[model samples]
Target: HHHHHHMVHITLDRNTANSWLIISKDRRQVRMGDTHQNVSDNKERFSNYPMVLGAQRFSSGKMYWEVDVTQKEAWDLGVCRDSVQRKGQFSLSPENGFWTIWLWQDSYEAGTSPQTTLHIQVPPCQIGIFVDYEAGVVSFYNITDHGSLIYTFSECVFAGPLRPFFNVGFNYSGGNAAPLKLCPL
Candidate 1:
């Protein structure tokens, strides 16, 4: 599918990042840091999860962005309502205003209520996320495999602005220190 025209530039929103998450100077990458960063503890910041939202927000229309997850042992990517709770731990699911797919312990899974596990033939080094607001669709594409569809969430009910969501799991003895990078569109 021709999706390049829908591509949008995305960057990590540092103000919403957790204390243990380090956002790169360019705001295009983020990873779990060894030490908690000394920064203002804003209400928008995540207190328990090592996650961050993108600076870009969307209320309507279609948008797509790519993320490089090369060598990352664990990571999560998708979109969520800007109003989602940030001060506490919450499950990543549609009911929680999050639509995502993640990789953990070398396994791929969908952030659905039942937590669907994915059996991927080729692990994607880069993932493309596409959201069609009015159509109520959120799709993940495996960029390393010819932009194939990895997962899709349909019939979603979104309200207000939606922000690109990201989660880089812990450093895990520095084995998963690779940062998640927002691809240049």
Candidate 2:
């Protein structure tokens, strides 16, 4: 089968990043800061949101980005509506305007409000997320295996503009510090 892929350059939106998270000098990587920075508790800053937003938003078209989550223990990532509530903890589910693929406790799953457990044949070496708003599809791929399919959310009802959202959550525990880096174009 013939396949095509494009270079997707992305940077973490420090404006929406958690105060405890640190963005690299080039803004291509995000990791838990050695110590929290004195940042304000802005609504857009991740506190209860558990993640950071990207600098880009999309209401239509196919958008994809890759993250190197190989050494991390957990994560929640995908697209979220711009209207998504930014405070006091919220569900990372489609019904809640966050359609994502999550990784935790050796399990891979899909975010659909209640969430669906996925059986991944192998641990993902790198993760790929595809958002096709008009087609109502949000899919995940294992980029390590030449972009092999992992899971997808079908028939999604995107309520508004969506932006790339990222999180490693409490994925680190006492020095398990691997920065989640966004690949450049």
Candidate 3:
């Protein structure tokens, strides 16, 4: 579709990845590790959350990327302001510079101030994220459903550059250990 025009290369930034996350050699995949990997903590790394950021930054125009979340029981996918808090606890809300949708337990929720719960007809195996910088829109698409839109965060205020956000949730009983793959465009 026309959206393919905006598709861009996205790889996990190793320096920004949490110590508990395992980044694939290709840097196109991320999965939660059973134990924290011994790695030097950097200022850009997430210390409290199992999150990683894409190496690419978007400051203007449109950008699109997809993540294959197959077999993932819980995960977070979206875009975040480059200046977002990387240390300590914080809510994954637009107020905190994150515009994301997450799958937790058996529910889908948007990272809004109050958090918006979404009722999707079919679970998305691969999720597509589209951002129109000039339009201030960030829409999520269900790639399995002919690219049907799942949700949209409109009128977003991105004060700085944005990066692809990923959070592989805690592996509860190892059910969520599946890796999240950044689909090649």
Candidates ranked, most accurate by lDDT first: 3, 1, 2
Error of 1 at 185 (Å): 1.8
Query: Could you tally the backbone clashes for each prediction?
Result: 0, 0, 0
Model 2 lDDT tens row, 1-185:
02125335677788898888878888888877666778877768867534788888788777777888877777887888888877776778877888888887778888866778887777886888877778898888887777778887888888999888888667446634677778654
Please provide the root mean square deviation of candidate 1 (C-alpha atoms, Å). 1.0
Per-residue C-alpha lDDT of model 3 across residues 1-185, encoded as one tens digit per residue: 36878889999999999998999999999999888789998899998878999999999999999999999889899999999999999999988999999999899999998989897898999999999999999999998989988899999998899999999888867788899999988
lDDT computed for candidate 3: 0.92
Q: Which stretches of candidate 2 lie over 4 Å from their true place?
A: 1-7
| Candidate 3: 10-residue stretch with minimal lDDT | 1-10
Model 2: which residue pairs collide?
none
Tell me each candidate's TM-score: 0.97, 0.90, 0.97
Q: Distance (Å) between predicted and true CA of 82, model 1?
A: 0.5
lDDT per model vs. reference: 0.91, 0.77, 0.92
Superposed on all Cα atoms, the candidates' RMSDs to the truth, in angstroms, are 1.0, 2.0, 1.0
The list of candidate 3 runs beyond 4 A from truth reads none
lDDT of 2 at 38: 82
